[PDB]
Amino acid sequence: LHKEPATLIKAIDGDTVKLMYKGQPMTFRLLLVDTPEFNEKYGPEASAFTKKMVENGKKIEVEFDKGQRTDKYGRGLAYIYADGKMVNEALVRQGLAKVAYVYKGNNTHEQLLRKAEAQAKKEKLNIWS
Numbered sequence: 001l002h003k004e005p006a007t008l009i010k011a012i013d014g015d016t017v018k019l020m021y022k023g024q025p026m027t028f029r030l031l032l033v034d035t036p037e038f039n040e041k042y043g044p045e046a047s048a049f050t051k052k053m054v055e056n057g058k059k060i061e062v063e064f065d066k067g068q069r070t071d072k073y074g075r076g077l078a079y080i081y082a083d084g085k086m087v088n089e090a091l092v093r094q095g096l097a098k099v100a101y102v103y104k105g106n107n108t109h110e111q112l113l114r115k116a117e118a119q120a121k122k123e124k125l126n127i128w129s
């Protein structure tokens with residue numbers, strides 16, 4: 001996989017973010033994770049964690065997997081990085097997202113994220129408390 005440039009347009013919630021990619025605005029949905037909705041428990045905390053990570057990043061990047069690049073709603077499907085740190089992994093490691101939506105052929109980082117989830121769960125963090 002390859003990281004590509006993007007700039008923040010605006011934070012949305014724990015697992016969606018609006019970015020400018022190849023000069024066009026797009027909503028991205030983070031691969032392999034599920035955060036609570038804003039109206040659910042840990043939803044506000046997941047939203048805040050993603051917002052801080054992407055707003056504080058000097059360099060945002062998009063990494064597509066090998067399969068579908070957009071979903072049925074027209075959202076981009078990617079791994080999102082801020083200053084080299086994966087947002088998708090970071091959410092899971094903090095117990096703010098579950099590993100989820102693992103479709104065959106867009107699952108390169110699955111085992112990395114399941115190892116972060118095991119660690120969050122062992123530490124009883126957030127969703128796992």
Ligand SMILES: Cc1cn([C@H]2C[C@H](OP(=O)(O)O)[C@@H](COP(=O)(O)O)O2)c(=O)[nH]c1=O
Nearest residue numbers: 029030031032033034071072077101103106
């Ligand atoms: C993360 C992900 C979600 N989706 C679709 C499945 C779900 O369909 P439904 O809307 O029919 O439930 C929806 C979950 O996204 P949200 O968790 O953002 O609601 O997005 C994909 O098709 N591919 C993906 O990789």
Ligand SMILES: [Ca+2]
Nearest residue numbers: 015034035036
């Ligand atoms: Ca969600």
